Amino acid sequence: MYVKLISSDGHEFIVKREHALTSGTIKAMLSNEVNFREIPSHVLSKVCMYFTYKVRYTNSSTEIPEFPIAPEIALELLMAANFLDC
Amino acid sequence: VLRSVNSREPSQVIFCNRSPRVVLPVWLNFDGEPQPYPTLPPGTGRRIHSYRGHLWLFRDAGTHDGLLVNQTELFVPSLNVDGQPIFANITLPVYTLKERCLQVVRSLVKPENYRRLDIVRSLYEDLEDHPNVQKDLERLT
Amino acid sequence: MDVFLMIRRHKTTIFTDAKESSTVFELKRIVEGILKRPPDEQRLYKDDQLLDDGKTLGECGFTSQTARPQAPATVGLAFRADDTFEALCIEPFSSPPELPDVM
Numbered sequence: 001m002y003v004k005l006i007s008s009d010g011h012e013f014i015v016k017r018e019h020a021l022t023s024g025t026i027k028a029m030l031s032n033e034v035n036f037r038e039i040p041s042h043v044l045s046k047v048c049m050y051f052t053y054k055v056r057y058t059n060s061s062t063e064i065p066e067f068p069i070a071p072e073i074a075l076e077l078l079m080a081a082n083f084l085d086c
Numbered sequence: 087v088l089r090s091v092n093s094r095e096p097s098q099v100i101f102c103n104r105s106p107r108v109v110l111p112v113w114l115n116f117d118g119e120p121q122p123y124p125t126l127p128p129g130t131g132r133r134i135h136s137y138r139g140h141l142w143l144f145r146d147a148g149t150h151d152g153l154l155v156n157q158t159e160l161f162v163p164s165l166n167v168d169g170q171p172i173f174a175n176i177t178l179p180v181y182t183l184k185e186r187c188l189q190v191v192r193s194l195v196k197p198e199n200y201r202r203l204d205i206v207r208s209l210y211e212d213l214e215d216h217p218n219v220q221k222d223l224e225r226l227t
Numbered sequence: 228m229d230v231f232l233m234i235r236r237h238k239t240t241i242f243t244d245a246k247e248s249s250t251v252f253e254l255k256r257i258v259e260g261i262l263k264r265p266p267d268e269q270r271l272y273k274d275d276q277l278l279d280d281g282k283t284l285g286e287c288g289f290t291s292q293t294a295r296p297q298a299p300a301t302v303g304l305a306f307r308a309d310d311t312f313e314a315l316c317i318e319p320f321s322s323p324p325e326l327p328d329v330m
């Protein structure tokens with residue numbers, strides 16, 4: 001099953017519920033759509049990619065690549081991760 | 087507590103850096119002091135002489151970010167079974183998104199400018215509280 | 228091998244994975260389960276190229292080493308309203324601000 005995470009600018013990101021539960025903050029907001037008034041789509045898209053990456057590479061032996069973050073999104077992405085606790 | 091035991095029983099090891107980071111190997115000596123050893127560029131290996139019961143950990147040489155070795159924090163050379171060296175596979179952990187963001191922000195902002203960033207005081211503190219072996223030795227203890 | 232995708236239409240983006248050996252039609256069935264629109268009312272695209280139902284994702288250039296979890300490949304999606312297909316439209320994500328001086 002999937003959940004919808006909606007950015008401040010209206011982008012609707014549909015991701016697997018278990019991936020989204022990577023964030024306890026998101027867990028609280030569900031307990032199946034969540035709006036983020038402070039997280040724009042260029043940040044929330046990256047957050048979703050992080051979920052996929054975390055779930056793919058957690059408990060795996062195959063070599064782990066760097067999670068890439070452009071300098072231009074790092075500050076907002078930092079603020080988002082701190083809010084989402086992930 | 088966290089110290090190498092003086093076994094005197096040799097153990098040959100391959101430090102194998104399967105990370106994109108320059109790696110600082112750190113040996114915990116008999117008094118528990120971290121002793122740094124020469125670095126390993128990304129994707130390179132070294133054959134080295136250590137001993138059973140000796141304790142090692144591995145860090146990004148530039149930033150001291152935590153690395154894993156055979157999927158754990160610490161590496162202890164074991165008995166060489168039929169002459170073969172023990173492989174110590176050094177890898178990136180799956181960092182939290184927060185910690186990865188802090189890495190990137192640290193790598194772009196001089197520490198004297200952390201305070202100039204528009205963020206909650208707690209994140210300034212998080213940036214300032216950068217990775218450090220001494221803190222990790224306290225946490226593991 | 229798994230490929231990791233963003234399937235995108237207007238302001239909708241689905242994050243999902245699929246087998247390199249799976250087909251375009253099969254990806255439409257995945258979209259159908261999520262967005263409740265049958266395969267025949269869907270067009271999938273790679274860039275501006277319409278994808279053929281019978282082709283594997285690998286054949287269309289969605290390979291495990293380029294469609295990665297941390298950087299998924301984009302599949303475009305267009306719906307048929309009644310008689311005719313809408314044109315492919317993907318709303319871009321927002322723009323980051325200018326780097327602060329200190330960065």
Ligand SMILES: CC(=O)N[C@@H](CC(C)C)C(=O)N[C@H](C(=O)N1C[C@H](O)C[C@H]1C(=O)NCc1ccc(-c2scnc2C)cc1)C(C)(C)C
Pocket residue numbers: 092094095101111113123124125126132134135136137140
């Ligand atoms: C002195 C003592 O009470 N015991 C000895 C063994 C005893 C049989 C004399 C002993 O443990 N010696 C240490 C020792 O030889 N060590 C400590 C670690 O187990 C590894 C080993 C060592 O230093 N080997 C040489 C070495 C040189 C370079 C490297 C590295 S790491 C990355 N690149 C290189 C080239 C790795 C190992 C020291 C550093 C005290 C001399």
